[PDB]
Amino acid sequence: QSNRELVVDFLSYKLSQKGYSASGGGGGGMAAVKQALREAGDEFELRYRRAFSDLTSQLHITPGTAYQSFEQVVNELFRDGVNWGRIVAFFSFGGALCVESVDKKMQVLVSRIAAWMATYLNDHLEPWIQENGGWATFVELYGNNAAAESRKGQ
Numbered sequence: 410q411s412n413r414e415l416v417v418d419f420l421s422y423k424l425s426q427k428g429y430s431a432s433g434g435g436g437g438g439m440a441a442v443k444q445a446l447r448e449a450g451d452e453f454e455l456r457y458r459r460a461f462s463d464l465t466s467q468l469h470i471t472p473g474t475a476y477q478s479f480e481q482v483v484n485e486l487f488r489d490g491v492n493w494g495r496i497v498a499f500f501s502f503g504g505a506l507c508v509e510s511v512d513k514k515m516q517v518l519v520s521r522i523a524a525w526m527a528t529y530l531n532d533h534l535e536p537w538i539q540e541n542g543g544w545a546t547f548v549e550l551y552g553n554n555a556a557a558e559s560r561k562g563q
């Protein structure tokens with residue numbers, strides 16, 4: 410439940426930044442994790458994503474795209490090991506795929522990408538997350554981004 414809630418919150422937040430409204434982006438026991446993931450995704454996208462190969466050039470999702478194709482491109486993030494920055498990059502990449510889907514009139518793919526992300530998180534990332542301090546350690550590492558909060562009037 411918590412991992413699905415994190416996926417749906419992040420995707421709702423990323424869609425909101427492009428004027429799109431999806432459910433699941435309101436609190437709950439994972440509120441601090443949702444906030445840290447949202448801020449880390451923004452900070453990654455603003456400053457650090459530019460250093461890396463743009464995964465959106467390799468995967469343009471249509472209703473015929475298979476999970477296996479998404480899995481192979483997402484695997485590039487983790488080939489040299491899982492870490493928190495690569496996990497944030499995975500959420501950011503899923504968010505960009507959802508924005509592209511709505512932009513292209515394929516909004517039915519948002520729920521499919523959310524399911525694909527929850528499956529990938531479960532199969533490939535959760536053992537690392539839970540044996541490397543859990544989401545609690547990610548929150549401790551990231552803290553809060555006061556400059557971004559001030560910029561957004563938060």
Ligand SMILES: O=C(NS(=O)(=O)c1ccc(N[C@H](CCN2CCOCC2)CSc2ccccc2)c(S(=O)(=O)C(F)(F)F)c1)c1csc(N2CCc3cccc(C(=O)Nc4nc5ccccc5s4)c3C2)n1
Pocket residue numbers: 449450452453457458461462463464465485486487492493494495497498499501502503505547550551552553554555
């Ligand atoms: O090793 C890494 N990072 S790390 O060293 O572990 C670290 C560094 C600092 C931080 N956090 C500070 C936080 C400092 N602020 C200061 C202000 O107050 C708040 C804190 C800076 S913000 C940030 C930077 C990187 C990642 C996430 C966030 C945190 S982090 O946030 O995960 C941590 F929790 F560890 F802190 C992790 C790292 C990150 S990504 C990465 N890879 C390597 C393998 C690979 C291969 C092929 C392609 C890509 C790829 O990403 N392509 C993409 N294309 C698209 C296209 C569209 C949409 C999304 C995407 S993503 C990548 C990405 N390797």
